[PDB]
Amino acid sequence: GNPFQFYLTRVSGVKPKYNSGALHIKDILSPLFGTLVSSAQFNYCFDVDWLVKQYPPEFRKKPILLVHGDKREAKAHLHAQAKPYENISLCQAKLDIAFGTHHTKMMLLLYEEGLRVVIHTSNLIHADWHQKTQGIWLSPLYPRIADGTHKSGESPTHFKANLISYLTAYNAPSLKEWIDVIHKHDLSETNVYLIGSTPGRFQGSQKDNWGHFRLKKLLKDHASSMPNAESWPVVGQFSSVGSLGADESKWLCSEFKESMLTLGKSSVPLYLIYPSVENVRTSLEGYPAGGSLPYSIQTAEKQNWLHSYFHKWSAETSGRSNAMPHIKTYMRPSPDFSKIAWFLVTSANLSKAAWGALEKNGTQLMIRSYELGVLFLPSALGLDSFKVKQATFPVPYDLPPELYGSKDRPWIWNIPYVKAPDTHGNMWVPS
Amino acid sequence: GNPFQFYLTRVSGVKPKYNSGALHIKDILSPLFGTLVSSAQFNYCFDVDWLVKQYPPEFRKKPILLVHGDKREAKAHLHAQAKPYENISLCQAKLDIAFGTHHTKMMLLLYEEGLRVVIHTSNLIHADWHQKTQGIWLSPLYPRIADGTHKSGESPTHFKANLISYLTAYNAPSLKEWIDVIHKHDLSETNVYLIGSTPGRFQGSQKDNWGHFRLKKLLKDHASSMPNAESWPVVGQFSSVGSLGADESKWLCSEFKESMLTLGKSSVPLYLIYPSVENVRTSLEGYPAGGSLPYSIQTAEKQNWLHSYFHKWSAETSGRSNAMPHIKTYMRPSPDFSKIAWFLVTSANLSKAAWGALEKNGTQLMIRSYELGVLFLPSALGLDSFKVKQATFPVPYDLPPELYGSKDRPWIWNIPYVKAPDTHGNMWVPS
DNA sequence: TGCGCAGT
DNA sequence: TGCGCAGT
């Protein structure tokens, strides 16, 4: 019981001092953490054979529910993958808005001794846990509420109700079982706030339930303004970039940064962290790290204005400068970067699909995707701010963020790079 | 028989030396120009009572066809206006693409002694012929082809066929009669090229039939490149402005200026002439000239980039600096403005609706509106260029065009101007 | 799939 | 009305 329960995944090919205190998926599903009865795996991509092999032998026949958003042929492929294992069910989360994804990454782990909730950033495929920087939040072991005891099991941060609303929004019968399981467990120790996105169009007070308006509300109610508030940068850090509009006022600096700079009841610097071509080239994977950084040329050339916000991936602090980011984080550092007002780890990349965007003249928040993250607020630990670990929050990358040099360019996955070979002597030719 | 047959309308309140050689509608429908049998009036707005009173008493019972594009209630109002006059029919030109207008202004004037075609810029309402600068082209009197003579009646410029294709595109039975009438007349003297727009989506070689691609083709085939071609500005001059896109490369400088700078088989300066607020304020009409310059704030604030092309209305040359422009013109002056490579007078304002814009990756030219204009090419008079009248072409405004001062702003019809009174002591409050 | 857009 | 748009 350190306060944050924030971990990185294990990286192959770094010194083992950068992997001590890091978690592989195998560690997470270990018998150490409890005697497993069943599980639910919420994700975007699955390699089903690999996933089963991550569970310990004693636990491989226990019911697994996969919660995915694939349709049609993808769906049929995933069903086919799952066919060999009788213990495995599937739940297709409904995606009624186009270009939506079931992007949330979460494990519900039901044990004989209680319940664990893991919220993280990694797809259920080998490459996502191999040589990338990913983030993980581990809930405590939530004990079961005794049969005749009447308690809510709720925390000051309202995690239990907030999780249940997130699950309730799917409308899925196989998730009813998980909702009932959460109901019977005591989640009162939880010291983080849940930030979910769910697909839809939301009006009035429901705008606050999801996406970046949910973050805004949490910050309004549970953080407080700082003297010189103006000067506390916002830092966003992500692996995919959506179509953000013709200029910054369309969404980024207008409705996204607004929500993010809220504190209690604008020239706030915005630093955006996204790997350069050069970062990808010299990575542990080389150019094929690029396959998980899907910023397409067509999107990029609409929005060249964006790339002057862009800063290098740099992670000397966690030995992970060459372990390309699939983690997404957002945070509110002080101007000197020695402390932070809050920290969010989430599945949500820098997209309107993920965070939400306003339609019909401000009356309506549209969200295409399922997302999930956890907000770390000083107030939930009786503090005003966290010191950055150089009590103190473990920021996985270096501060302050360093601006792309003038020869740098963002990684764009679907053009060739044939001038300089990568780490493994290779070029990149999408095809 | 001066070569151009290009006239301005009569302006009330200027010295009569600026109205000698100018034409009122009454002059155009005069018995002087022939003994009228019937007529067709192509236009956008009609005041039917006023129009009938423009025809001489002897000619008021002769068949008039009105060719309009009104639907629904507008249509019913125009039908009601026309009700009292048994000699008057109507033809509704089909407008299958939204935000299209039947904007063409043309009179077909059938006489006992032959046929006249008038192509011009004025709506058939009193205010359009009162104190505005408008343009008129008068065809010669085309004699009838004798019954057993076999001649085409065509000109070197292909006017007759080109007019007939324009009329044929309406698909209107009441226009069949006019097509047959044009067929029986000799139009061989015509020394101008017809430039039409008609509504639709046009592919392949049909892209060249209409709008700005029609202008491009004419310029390719019948003008020739100039030494220093690069440096001959393009001048556009209009009374309405459409939505041209988020920046200049979207249409204006990409496909519109391209068509306009074509000469035979880019840093070409583009000068756009459009009345400032100050031009409208001190006009003969004052702020109500604004009612015919319908550039709305919503369109303007999307495209502030445009307004650095904007130049004042100035017309000392024709005594018409205070007679606000409803004429539209485009032309190709030399760098010193002493001569021009060509001149176009037309109904088409600075809009994609009018000129056309490419859809589906360059394969398709979409046009919303009916338009019509006449192109004056030196080659059709055996010349290489026209000297500007200061043989020589009568440019109705001053050269070179003068840039908006830094306190000037474009006229925008639907915001208030309440700081400085106009010519008649009034303010402007749309409402 | 449904939003936002487009005249004189 | 029909075009262009929008994910990881």
Residue numbers in the entry:
A (entry chain A), B (entry chain A): 161 to 425, 433 to 557, 568 to 608
List passages from the publication reporting this PDB structure.
Tdp1 hydrolyses the 3′-phosphotyrosine linkage between Top1 and DNA, releasing Top1 and preventing DSBs. To establish how Tdp1 recognises duplex DNA structures, we determined two X-ray crystal structures of Tdp1(Δ148) bound to duplex DNA. The aromatic ring of F259 intercalates between the −2 and −3 scissile strand bases, forming a π–π stack with the −3 base and demarcating the junction of melted and duplex DNA.
Two different DNA sequences were designed, containing either guanine or thymine at the −2 position, and cytosine or adenine at the −11 position, but being otherwise identical. The Tdp1(Δ148) complexes formed with these oligonucleotides are referred to as −2G or −2T, respectively. The −2G Tdp1(Δ148):DNA complex diffracted X-rays to 2.04 Å, whereas the −2T complex diffracted to 3.18 Å. Although the DNA substrate contained a 3′ guanine (0G), the electron density clearly indicates the 3′ nucleotide is phosphorylated thymine. Based on this result, we hypothesised that, during preparation and crystallisation of the nucleoprotein complex, Tdp1(Δ148) removed the terminal 3′ 0G nucleoside, leaving a 3′-phosphate on the terminal −1T nucleotide. This represents a Tdp1 product complex. The 3′-phosphate adopts tetrahedral geometry, in contrast to the trigonal bi-pyramidal coordination of the vanadate in the quaternary complex that mimics the transition state25. The three nucleotides at the 5′ end of the complementary strand (C, A and C) were not visible in the crystal structure of the −2G Tdp1(Δ148):DNA complex.
